[PDB]
Design an enzyme around this catalytic site. Sequence first.
Site, PDB file in Angstrom:
ATOM      1  CG  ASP A 290      -2.092  -1.022   0.988  1.00  0.00           C
ATOM      2  OD1 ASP A 290      -2.568  -1.157  -0.161  1.00  0.00           O
ATOM      3  OD2 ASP A 290      -2.489  -1.683   1.961  1.00  0.00           O
ATOM      4  CE1 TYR A 374      -8.066  -5.921   3.732  1.00  0.00           C
ATOM      5  CE2 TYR A 374      -9.350  -5.063   5.639  1.00  0.00           C
ATOM      6  CZ  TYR A 374      -8.801  -6.146   4.894  1.00  0.00           C
ATOM      7  OH  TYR A 374      -8.984  -7.457   5.285  1.00  0.00           O
TER       8      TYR A 374
HETATM    9 CU   LIG Z   1      -7.402  -8.106   7.110  1.00  0.00          CU
END
Ligand SMILES: [Cu+2]
Lengths: 620, 620
Positions: A290, A374
């Site tokens: 990320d 996320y």
């Molecule tokens: Cu997770």
Amino acid sequence: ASPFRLASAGEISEVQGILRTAGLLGPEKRIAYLGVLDPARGAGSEAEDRRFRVFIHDVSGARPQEVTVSVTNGTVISAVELDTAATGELPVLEEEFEVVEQLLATDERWLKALAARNLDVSKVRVAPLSAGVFEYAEERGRRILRGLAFVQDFPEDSAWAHPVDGLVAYVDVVSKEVTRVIDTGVFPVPAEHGNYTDPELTGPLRTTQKPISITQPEGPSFTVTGGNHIEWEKWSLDVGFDVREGVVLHNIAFRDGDRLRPIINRASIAEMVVPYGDPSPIRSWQNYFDTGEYLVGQYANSLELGCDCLGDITYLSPVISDAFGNPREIRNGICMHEEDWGILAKHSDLWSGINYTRRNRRMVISFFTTIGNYDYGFYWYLYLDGTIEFEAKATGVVFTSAFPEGGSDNISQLAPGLGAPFHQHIFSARLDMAIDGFTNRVEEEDVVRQTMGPGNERGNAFSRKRTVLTRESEAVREADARTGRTWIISNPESKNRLNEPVGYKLHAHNQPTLLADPGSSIARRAAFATKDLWVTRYADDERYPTGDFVNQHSGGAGLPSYIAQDRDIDGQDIVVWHTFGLTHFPRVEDWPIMPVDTVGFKLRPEGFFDRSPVLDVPAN
Amino acid sequence: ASPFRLASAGEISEVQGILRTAGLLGPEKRIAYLGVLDPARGAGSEAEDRRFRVFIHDVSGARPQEVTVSVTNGTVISAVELDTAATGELPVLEEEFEVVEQLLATDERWLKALAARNLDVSKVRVAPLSAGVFEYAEERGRRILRGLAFVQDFPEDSAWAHPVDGLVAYVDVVSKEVTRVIDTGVFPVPAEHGNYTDPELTGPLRTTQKPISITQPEGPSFTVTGGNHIEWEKWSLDVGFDVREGVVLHNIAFRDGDRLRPIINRASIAEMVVPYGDPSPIRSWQNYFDTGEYLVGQYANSLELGCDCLGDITYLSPVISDAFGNPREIRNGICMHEEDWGILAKHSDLWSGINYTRRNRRMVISFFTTIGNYDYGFYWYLYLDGTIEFEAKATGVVFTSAFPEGGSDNISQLAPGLGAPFHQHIFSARLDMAIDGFTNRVEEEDVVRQTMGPGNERGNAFSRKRTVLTRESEAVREADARTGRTWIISNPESKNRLNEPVGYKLHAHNQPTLLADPGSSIARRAAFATKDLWVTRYADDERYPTGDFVNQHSGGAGLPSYIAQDRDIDGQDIVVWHTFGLTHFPRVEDWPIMPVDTVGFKLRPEGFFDRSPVLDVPAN
Ligand SMILES: [Cu+2]
Ligand SMILES: [Cu+2]
Ligand code: NA
Ligand code: NA
């Protein structure tokens, strides 16, 4: 005036003009990364020179470039062409995300796969994911994204509830061609919705919560000067922001009586990787870097008062560059506030008759980022007693798959037919240490058990041992929770009043490190994640544990390359890199939106002060 | 009405009258322990029968007695004479602690030892400490305390700054005899004071801290009924208090729709041991069983609003017995309040356009105890999302010694000539589980690494394995942080909507367990502390991991004797015992009063619910 001030909209505007005039920012060009460079090591550096580092992508296929510009002087300092087959591709561009779904919507193999499943292409969302490096020789030197499909039943539907398993596509986002469509078989698309704001799923909302009001009638105890310099309860630091790393802390120091004592020169989360543990060929390539591939700062949320940050909040609004060099403000992107933190110290003494209680508090610096499904919160805490702590908060929506008939050893069931593959979330904290100055060393401290016998006749004794890490080749360490292993960063040339070197102790959470097979592609590209602690000698260009260009790099970049220099680290300018992570076996309670789970580390003074540093805290 | 209500002053007075009427509480008798017994298994049944268990000491040297009384019916149910040389001495009486310093002040061996050090006996405080079981045969069957000396320069002085090393005395507190005085040589008495309220040590107090105001304008979100029954945000429980264990939680349940689902029948800290690791004969016997030997509830503090407990506080004031059977109230001894706890869940979705944030909260139930130099806070937390957590906070003044001139492997230096011996603080949590009822099982869950090869061609897969513990002989387990080991308590007869057994997962901190040699006295008496997890079959009389009578008791009772029964625990009424603790190598920053350090454990739902249990939390 400070060299560590946040980048200005005006600075980014000047960078854009300098690049344009130099012929480096034509219509085929895109800025993939732009950030300010820290000052070089120079105790007394007074000549202000604000320099920016820029990665320039070319959408027509020409070679990309790394450029360094001086905004103070208005010049290009250097510009080098990159051979991405050798040193890695540039970070993923936000505008490349849309291209994946668009390209597949007109591809005949993709449409035939959807037609077999009776899916309307207008309702199919494609998650555009980083490619990694695997067996496909045709991918070397090309910018590839891989796509996985999800069905959105209506515009406000949560597509994550409806994965289309058995199907994956690979896309060259430069030449705009679909290189492969792989269809391994038809799986039912899970039908239950996961809409966590739909009253039919939530039921009636609770009316039982009464308000908690947190106010500071005289305002906060910290001051903010020069835009981003913080002073709070003897702490002093600068809050930076970089589009790749997010919040960066500079010049962390503690005012001990009359001296400002340095502790950490630069603190950041320099990488974070999310490897998936499902062996299905639909997902066995899936690993998010990320920080390195996507850039977590560019997806920072605007944080809402009373919801995201509660209390008397001071905001910073960092400025970044968009893909064309225009300044973009992230309004209310960083929250700063202090929080009560319970009892600091307490004793009721029978013999003296004195009853003593003091309360603790912490300074909080936080931001939140969203990358696809996320959402991650990054929290730095400073405590009254000298403790420094980092905490990552993971929430959002878990990444989903079909749940196979007959079960799975690598996927959790969340709902009928709906699976969630096993994965980890692993962070790397880069701590450029400066314990009372730059001459530092690291010791590994283990508990030592002693056997009953002479000198220990009752068998009660125990002790500890410390081992100095003297060279980089011996400074790759693993946790050992059973022996209470910690690491101490000390300054051998600065002693406390007992003539012991001053130090800070790092306390790890001792969670599992990278689980993948050591011969896997992900173990080579995320080698940092295989060990808990690394120590390197400081160098200006050794910034990330995965190297400068993580996207589609074949492996070995970053920490394994740095460590191979085997430099002296015994009383030198050193950098500590701590790996820590969450191993996530999704549970039913994580669905349809996941309650926060946390992981982190902390550093505590170890003979840094001559006595408790919080004796001057008042009773109130 | 509720059988789980706190003991009332009237109940304690009625016990006194019943004992007196029965001839069991004449002038030579003392109550060393008094507490209410929980209802036997069998819901209802008694309609109302409040029973109390009493340990009765005799100051003339006659055998003590264990007595059970029914306050409802006004009867003695049973009374047994105890053979303390076999089964252990009663807990230490508060009035016995005073006896030690007085007796020593008239003993010629003690006086000559102080004269050799030019110390005035009027300024010497004696810490009276539990004796344990070592090589002194004359102590078997006698109540012994051991005394260590500290100088108090003036009435408000912290005596802990001035240990008198090289000197220890043993006292028979019933016959009032000094049995032994051991003098291994003169050490200098450290001269620096440790007075943390003296302005010459604190310096000027900080003026920089601005107030933090935490208020609840509509009052708290929890309700208290029947004196100690709490309802808060779907949780339901009863808050008990016992003079030995302190705060006890009963009947922890969660309201899931229209059903009250049990989770834990009884939760307590059932023992805590503080072993010292200094092999000097002056201290090598030193081990505190704060719960079993001293009774931590007896020494609970009155907690002051705005200092100890901040916010909208609801207090309980539990009642205990004094040594004569009179009720004594601990005013404001338990604080209860709810606390904001940051972000609960958050997601910003690109495809749906929905931005969602919810905040978390926890309910806090706490008390603080002071035993000599140490002060311990016990905190139970309940969270919105079903998590249960316990946290111990250790503070107070560290126990001191001389620092030897040649240094030490088992003692830290805090100040010139002043040492602090290494030690541990180890807790035992007794969790009488009731996950959806009483048919429960424990599984050990480890991460499983997988080799690259067929079916895992990219070497990315990882898995987990669960092992059911079926018999007590196999339910003594160790931590393994490297494999991410946790334990799951499930109900094999209660399934969630995915047809999986409902469960809760225990997450340990994985700190070192007892370090002493396995052949030592302390390893035998605190066998529970040598392993992280024990599971037993429930039995009414198996209450403490160390047995009923810990003081001066050799091994032979407690958890090792319980598990020898090798009872079936696979889908049965079971009890989890979790060992967790801090290993304390004191630092300079711990002096002269210690900032709080913490340790604990938590339980999280694992497929207990059919989806996230906090979808009905409002936005606020
Ligand atoms: Cu997770
Ligand atoms: Cu301690
Ligand atoms: Na450094
Ligand atoms: Na049970």
